[PDB]
Ligand binder design. Structure first.
Ligand SMILES: Nc1ncnc2c1ncn2[C@@H]1O[C@H](COP(=O)(O)OP(=O)(O)O)[C@@H](O)[C@H]1O
Ligand SMILES: Nc1ncnc2c1ncn2[C@@H]1O[C@H](COP(=O)(O)OP(=O)(O)O)[C@@H](O)[C@H]1O
Ligand SMILES: Cc1cn([C@H]2C[C@H](O)[C@@H](COP(=O)(O)O)O2)c(=O)[nH]c1=O
Ligand SMILES: Cc1cn([C@H]2C[C@H](O)[C@@H](COP(=O)(O)O)O2)c(=O)[nH]c1=O
Ligand SMILES: [Ca+2]
Ligand SMILES: [Ca+2]
Ligand SMILES: [Ca+2]
Ligand SMILES: [Ca+2]
Ligand SMILES: [Ca+2]
Ligand SMILES: [Ca+2]
Ligand SMILES: [Ca+2]
Ligand SMILES: [Ca+2]
Ligand SMILES: [Ca+2]
Ligand SMILES: [Ca+2]
Ligand SMILES: [Ca+2]
Ligand SMILES: [Ca+2]
Ligand SMILES: [Ca+2]
Ligand SMILES: [Ca+2]
Ligand SMILES: [Ca+2]
Ligand SMILES: [Cl-]
Ligand SMILES: [Cl-]
Ligand SMILES: [Cl-]
Lengths: 186, 185
């Protein structure tokens, strides 16, 4: 039961904006909704750990995964079991784009760590707000270009799961597009 | 450099023997670095785990994040400077506690560890073995851990040295020294 949805995209791409608009939209339709986010939905203190200066990308990813493991077990799976629409503002694809394409960590390793962390849980749809890198720990332009292109590659590899939207479109037009993709599921 | 670890249950004498081992090495003029897990990489992970109860998976992943920093910032640089690096707990702790204790599958733990450690393995690991009731869930968890350590040791008899932790401090230290002497001048 339940429906698992996520929002993805670069910093400043509108994920939180659209995630919250979606939650209220579905709540107004009488649907039970659980709005959550990463990092911090499993282990809130992970945000502190993530700020540590000079963190290796390996330790960085392992922190995101620790949070993700707790998040899936304690928040997402129980919410879905109750028949809720669970919306996560970021999920695993964030690590793949940032720690994989951005930091250069090997994707298969990321995936293998993820397999137990997530228990294989994948969103039914993922809305990728595609933002030019200039518009967006070493998070400079070259990193954001890698991450931006990584997300687009992840979307090409799973074109049924990913819905790619132009993040520069007006907020209301993006929301209407998100709603239209959901209409057949809800 | 030379990488050595100590392993065993809480109260098995790890920190004590790690201290005596460093002292022995100092007496021979051998540069030594004493370190520990958890907290050698990310001190905040230690303090957080002190007061927080998590899923085994999340717990292991924090120990691994800490371990990843520990290897990179402390252990590998120590070894590159030619030090004998002693870690009071390392990967075998996760295998015994999170693997055998909490039930996580070992091959998954090891694939996570593979990038976290950069494949860095101790040359020797001294396991200070004793029943949980002799250490200086209830007891069933700690028995799973103690048996897990012994499982690990019998799978890698070239790396593990298993000592009777109930012996007097000095005898154990001399036992450790005996095992180590072939690896030094
Ligand atoms: N479609 C949009 N066009 C222009 N600005 C937007 C749009 N959506 C959100 N914003 C604004 O951009 C900033 C970043 O939005 P936010 O939702 O925080 O992005 P993210 O959560 O992906 O970092 C906010 O100031 C927000 O008001
Ligand atoms: N061989 C031994 N015999 C008796 N007491 C010991 C011995 N080794 C250590 N101790 C004492 O036992 C306690 C636990 O030792 P410690 O080195 O802290 O173990 P761990 O680091 O494994 O928890 C300490 O109070 C220490 O003084
Ligand atoms: C969830 C997640 C976030 N991030 C980054 C994106 C942001 O720069 C930062 C905080 O995310 P937030 O701004 O969406 O809360 O964490 C990763 O690098 N990997 C991840 O897995
Ligand atoms: C290093 C490590 C320790 N532990 C446990 C064993 C001890 O109970 C505790 C360490 O406590 P300490 O920080 O007071 O020595 O952490 C694990 O469960 N897994 C690990 O990987
Ligand atoms: Ca984007
Ligand atoms: Ca946001
Ligand atoms: Ca929306
Ligand atoms: Ca803090
Ligand atoms: Ca996370
Ligand atoms: Ca993960
Ligand atoms: Ca996602
Ligand atoms: Ca960083
Ligand atoms: Ca509208
Ligand atoms: Ca100790
Ligand atoms: Ca650790
Ligand atoms: Ca590890
Ligand atoms: Ca005891
Ligand atoms: Ca066991
Ligand atoms: Ca055994
Ligand atoms: Cl797909
Ligand atoms: Cl679009
Ligand atoms: Cl012995």
């Amino acid at each position: 039961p339940g429906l698992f949805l996520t929002l993805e995209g670069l910093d400043g791409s509108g994920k939180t904006t659209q995630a919250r608009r979606l939650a209220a939209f579905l709540e107004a339709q009488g649907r039970p909704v659980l709005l959550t986010r990463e990092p911090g939905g499993g282990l809130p203190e992970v945000r502190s750990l993530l700020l540590t200066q000079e963190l290796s990308p390996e330790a960085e990813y392992l922190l995101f995964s620790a949070d993700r493991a707790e998040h899936v077990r304690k928040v997402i799976l129980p919410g879905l079991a109750a028949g809720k629409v669970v919306i996560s503002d970021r999920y695993l694809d964030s690590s793949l784009a940032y720690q994989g394409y951005g930091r250069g960590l090997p994707l298969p390793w990321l995936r293998e760590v993820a397999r137990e962390a997530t228990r294989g849980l994948k969103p039914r749809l993922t809305f990728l707000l595609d933002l030019p890198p200039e518009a967006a720990e070493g998070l400079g332009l070259e990193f954001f270009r890698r991450v931006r292109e990584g997300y687009l590659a992840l979307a090409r590899a799973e074109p049924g799961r990913f819905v790619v939207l132009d993040a520069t479109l007006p907020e209301e037009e993006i929301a209407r597009a998100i709603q239209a993709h959901l209409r057949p599921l809800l």
